[PDB]
């Protein structure tokens, strides 16, 4: 009963199958949080495992560019995952408002995303759901820190061991190996980084179709390009890092560590 006692619920931030995220205040502390509220009334054994998995992964990850679990509280019929509140809104919103980022701004943004990803991978965590909606800005001030959020689809892996872990992710950001239904792991996250970096620089995605089956065909084939006019003044080094991220063969795809040493990120 530690949640009902100490915390007051305010506005809804988002909604899932069996869950809700709401701003909350720890009343006696005068401090606000993001409460993920999971309804556990007659929850399946599998859905319990997925709650426990997310709790375990979120406790594991301590990094400036990853949302921080503050507490995990089991009450009768509800579970509470309390996270530090990030108030600058989604990277998605900021790209749409600004249209696109400068190469300097994009590099600084993608650098922080890669540090979050590197940390996850080093800790045996694959997110599987990287996209601008899942990256939160620390504030509305320019250059404010980016935080990886929403580990609801995250998996635990054993070192470099890969398997068919099942079909999960967001269409525009899905890796070819997930769509092919082939073994996968940490590299899926780097494919998504490539989609995000592409979006940062020109403000529209590399893969899009009204027909999902045609979208999947373009992703599986790596059928992206750099059309005029928006790509006309973009450096080849930016394109090079995107190409290495959007590599079909996950064995040959650039890693987080390798990406952070790419000149377009490190010589800067």
């Amino acid at each position: 009963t530690r949640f009902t006692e100490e915390y007051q619920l305010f506005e809804e931030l988002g909604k899932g199958a069996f869950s809700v995220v709401r701003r909350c205040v720890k009343v006696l502390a005068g401090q606000e949080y993001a409460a993920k509220i999971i309804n556990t009334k007659k929850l399946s054994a599998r859905d319990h495992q997925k709650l426990e998995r997310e709790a375990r992964i979120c406790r594991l990850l301590k990094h400036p560019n990853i949302v921080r679990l503050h507490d995990s509280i089991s009450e009768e019929g509800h579970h509470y995952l309390i996270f530090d509140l990030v108030t600058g809104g989604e990277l998605f919103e900021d790209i749409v408002a600004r249209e696109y980022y400068s190469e300097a701004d994009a590099s600084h943004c993608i650098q922080q995303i890669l540090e979050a990803v590197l940390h996850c991978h080093q800790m045996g965590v694959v997110h599987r759901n990287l996209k601008p909606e899942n990256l939160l800005l620390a504030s509305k001030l320019k250059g404010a820190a980016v935080k990886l959020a929403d580990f609801g689809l995250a998996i635990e892996v054993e070192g470099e061991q890969q398997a068919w872990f099942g079909f999960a992710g967001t269409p525009g950001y899905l890796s070819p190996e997930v769509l092919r239904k082939d073994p996968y792991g940490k590299p899926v996250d780097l494919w998504a980084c490539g989609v995000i970096l592409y979006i940062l620089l020109v403000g529209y995605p590399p893969f899009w179709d009204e027909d999902q089956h045609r979208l999947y065909k373009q992703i599986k084939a790596g059928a992206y390009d750099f059309p005029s006019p928006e790509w006309d003044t973009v450096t080849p080094e930016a394109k090079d890092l995107i190409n290495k991220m959007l590599t079909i063969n996950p064995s040959k795809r650039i890693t987080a560590a390798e990406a952070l040493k790419h000149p377009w990120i490190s010589h800067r």
Partner: peptide
Amino acid sequence: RNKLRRQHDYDTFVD
């Protein structure tokens, strides 16, 4: 022409 749109996650194959 390609557009930036919000998209929902899938936790299983959806045709």
